[PDB]
Amino acid sequence: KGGVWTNVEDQILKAAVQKYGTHQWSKVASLLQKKTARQSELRWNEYLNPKLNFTEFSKEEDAQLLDLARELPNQWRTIADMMARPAQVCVERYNRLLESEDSEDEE
């Protein structure tokens, strides 16, 4: 029942945030059917927002990462701030990184 995100709905959400601002999410789920506020706001902060950093990882990004993940035991909200990245991107990059060591109409 809980839905994934079509590009339709996603676009409507972006235009909505453009009109209504961030804080009025319950007005965003008015436009967007089949979804809730918490879902909307949740996605906008986690994924859709353009200010987020989705980019490749430099050789320094990885060093700094491994450094932190060793320094701070599992806290991926804090670390994410330290890296200025969304968290599950950071965890994704991290797990893939240790694996370097290896051996319509209604819409």
Partner 1 sequence: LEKRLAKIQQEQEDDEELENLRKKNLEMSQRAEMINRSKHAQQEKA
Partner 2 sequence: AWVSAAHYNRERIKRGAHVEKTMVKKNLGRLTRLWIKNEQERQRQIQKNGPEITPEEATTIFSVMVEWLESRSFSPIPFPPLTYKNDTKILVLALEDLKDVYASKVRLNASEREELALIEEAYDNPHDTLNRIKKYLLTQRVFKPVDITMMENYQNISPVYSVDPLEKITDAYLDQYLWYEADQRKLFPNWIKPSDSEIPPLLVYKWTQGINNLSEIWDVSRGQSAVLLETTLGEMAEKIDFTLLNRLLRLIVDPNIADYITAKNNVVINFKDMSHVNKYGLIRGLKFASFIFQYYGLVIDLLLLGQERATDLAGPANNPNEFMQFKSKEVEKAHPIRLYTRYLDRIYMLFHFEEDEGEELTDEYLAENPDPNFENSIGYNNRKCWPKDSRMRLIRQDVNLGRAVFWEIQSRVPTSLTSIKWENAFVSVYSKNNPNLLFSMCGFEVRILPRQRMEEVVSNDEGVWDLVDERTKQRTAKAYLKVSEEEIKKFDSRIRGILMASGSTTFTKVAAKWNTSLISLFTYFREAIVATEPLLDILVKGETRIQNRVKLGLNSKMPTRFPPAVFYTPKELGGLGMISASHILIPASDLSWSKQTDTGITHFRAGMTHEDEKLIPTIFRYITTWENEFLDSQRVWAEYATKRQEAIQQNRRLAFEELEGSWDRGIPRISTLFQRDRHTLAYDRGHRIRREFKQYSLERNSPFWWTNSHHDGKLWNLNAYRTDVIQALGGIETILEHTLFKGTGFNSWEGLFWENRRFTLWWSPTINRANVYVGFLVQLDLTGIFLHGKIPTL
Q: Which residues of this protein are in contact with partner 2, per CB under 8 A? A: 23, 36, 42, 72-78, 81, 87-88, 91
Closest approach of partner 1 to the CB of residue 46, in Å: 24
66, 62, 46, 64: which is closest to 54 by C-alpha?
46
- DSSP secondary structure string, 13-73? HHHHHHHH-STTHHHHHHHSTT--HHHHHHHIIIII-TTS------HHHHHHHHHHHHHSS
List all residues 6 or more positions away from 104 whose beta carbon is below 8 Å from its beta carbon: none
Report if residue 69 touches partner 1, rule: CB under 8 A: yes
Task: Measure the N-to-C terminal CA separation of the chain; round to a whole number of Å.
Answer: 17
Closest approach of partner 2 to the CB of residue 102, in Å: 19
> Which position among 77, 95, 105, 106 is part of the footprint of partner 1 (CB under 8 A)?
95
Residue 42 interface partner, choices partner 1, partner 2, none, CB cut-off 5-8 Å depending on type: partner 2
Closest approach of partner 2 to the CB of residue 15, in Å: 22
Closest approach of partner 2 to the CB of residue 105, in Å: 26
Contact residues: partner 1, CB under 8 A: 66, 69-70, 95, 98, 101
